[PDB]
């Protein structure tokens, strides 16, 4: 909530790493 | 229960399919009457054109939506000469089959469910069974044959009107040149896609007719239950149409997208 920077800046599951 | 219901619907569809030659040989005049009734509607909806008018209006609306949003977005980006290329692939792949399926479901399927429910309540199916007539062969198989005969002209009109609406909106309201639209339409449209779309629509129409005939044939509860049967049949038809289109598009273009622009 306080650190919400957008849907583009949230970590997403899956993929390399 | 669940397996029992699946078995009942499987028995109904098998019995309806295996009686298609019997209906074709024995009942030709009934098939022609049902073809006319499905093509030109029945009741109060027949005076406006019937299934043809509803299909035409809905497909014109879908094509207009495609052209409208497409041209707006591409003009915002700047590459707006691709609208004719964007509209065709929008109509054939996703929009026209599903939209025509839902309109066909509504009109023809709800009419069939209402008719078969009224026959069931009015003891006309009992009258047919008493007179030594296969009720499923006389009613459901005839509906299936009429739907199979009528679907190809209906979907041809749907495709024609969707294309016409998209082209008219793009080249009249948005004042795009007709030459550019026709070039990008006829260059990036493959007739193979249209043929496969026709096959999808034929299969979908057969499934929809089977589902609605099942819901109308086993109706119960007097005149009140017919409306509930119509609603349930409509829900099932929507789900089945969308699933059929998705599966067919996944199978056809899973490996080869059948579209080339770059080198």
């Amino acid at each position: 909530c306080g650190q919400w920077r957008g849907i583009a800046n949230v970590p997403l599951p899956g993929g390399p790493g | 229960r669940f397996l029992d219901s699946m078995g009942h619907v499987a028995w109904f569809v098998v019995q309806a399919i295996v009686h298609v030659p019997h209906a074709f040989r024995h009942y030709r005049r009934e098939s022609l009457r049902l073809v006319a009734e499905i093509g030109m509607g029945t009741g109060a909806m027949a005076v406006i054109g019937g299934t043809v008018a509803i299909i035409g209006f809905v497909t014109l609306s879908a094509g207009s939506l495609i052209a409208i949003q497409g041209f707006a977005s591409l003009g915002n980006i700047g590459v707006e000469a691709f609208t004719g290329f964007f509209a065709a692939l929008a109509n054939i792949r996703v929009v026209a089959p599903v939209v025509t399926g839902q309109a066909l479901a509504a009109t023809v399927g709800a009419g069939a469910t209402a008719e078969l429910g009224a026959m069931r309540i009015s003891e006309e199916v009992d009258a047919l069974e008493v007179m030594g007539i296969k009720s499923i062969s006389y009613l459901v198989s005839t509906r299936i044959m009429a739907g199979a005969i009528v679907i190809i002209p209906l979907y041809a009109m749907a495709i024609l009107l969707s294309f016409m609406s998209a082209q008219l909106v793009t080249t009249i309201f948005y004042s795009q040149s007709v030459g550019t639209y026709e070039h990008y339409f006829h260059t990036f449209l493959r007739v193979d896609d249209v043929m496969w779309s026709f096959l999808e629509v034929i299969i979908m129409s057969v499934i929809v007719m089977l589902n609605h005939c099942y819901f109308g044939y086993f109706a119960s509860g007097g005149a009140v239950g017919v409306g509930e049967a119509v609603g349930r049949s409509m829900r099932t038809s929507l789900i089945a149409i969308v699933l059929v289109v998705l599966l067919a598009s996944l199978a056809l273009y899973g490996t080869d997208p059948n579209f080339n622009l770059t080198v």
């Binding site: 957008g6 849907i7 583009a8 949230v10 997403l12 899956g14 993929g15 | 009741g43 109060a44 909806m45 509803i54 209006f57 809905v58 609306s61 879908a62 207009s64 939506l65 409208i68 949003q69 707006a72 977005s73 003009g75 915002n76 980006i77 692939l89 792949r93 996703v94 599903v98 839902q102 309109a103 509504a106 009109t107 709800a110 469910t113 209402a114 429910g117 009224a118 007097g222 005149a223 009140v224 017919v226 409306g227 049967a229 119509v230 609603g231 409509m234 829900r235 929507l238 969308v242 699933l243 289109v245 998705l246 598009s249 996944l250 273009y253 997208p257 579209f259 080339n260 622009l261 770059t262």
Partner: protein, 253 residues
Amino acid sequence: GQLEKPLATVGGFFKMSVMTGKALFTRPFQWKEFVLQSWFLIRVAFLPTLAVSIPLTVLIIFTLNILLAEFGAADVSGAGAALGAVTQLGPLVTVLVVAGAGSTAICADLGARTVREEIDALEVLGIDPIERLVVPRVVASTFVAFMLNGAVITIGLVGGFFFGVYIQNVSAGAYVSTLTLLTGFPEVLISVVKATLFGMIAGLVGCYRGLTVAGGSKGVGTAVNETLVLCVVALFAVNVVLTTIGVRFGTGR
């Protein structure tokens, strides 16, 4: 005279809707009936809504991804993924699974009340059906359409993300970072307006057809079929008009 016949039913529907609005803004609201009809429409048109929305959005995402991958610009797919889902897929799936399920259910229920003389039973008791029945059903239709449109848009976006990333091997960051490229406040606002209008019109048409059922042995089924056809046609026309209005504003421009 040819146009005068459907115009009578049109006028009946319009007068009934005007009386419904007057009863909503003047007479006390029926909270109990509104809650009952809201839950009824939710239970009758939630699972079909997802079962139509998930494969349809998967199909749209698949088509968009393959066409863009051949085009070469496969990183902007999420843009289209948003652009359709907010403004067309949401409201149109709402149209389908509301007109097919909830509008037909309302028409069938009111037709059942009419053929059983329950409407006349209310009318001889001094009660007005338009305030006790139609208003909660229209408000419930609007509320359920709003919520279902929101759920459809969310589920479509999430399913498109998962399909594109885990099946067609597009980049996840390109999907989530390009969603807002072409979609903003105007798109979600016009989607909300579309859903509200669609629900209200579907409720009105269902109630009007249910109250004027012809009885007989096929009257209720004919009324339900006519309700469904009228709802589909009217909602498609309203969707065309609202789409034109919405693209007039635009996020890109």
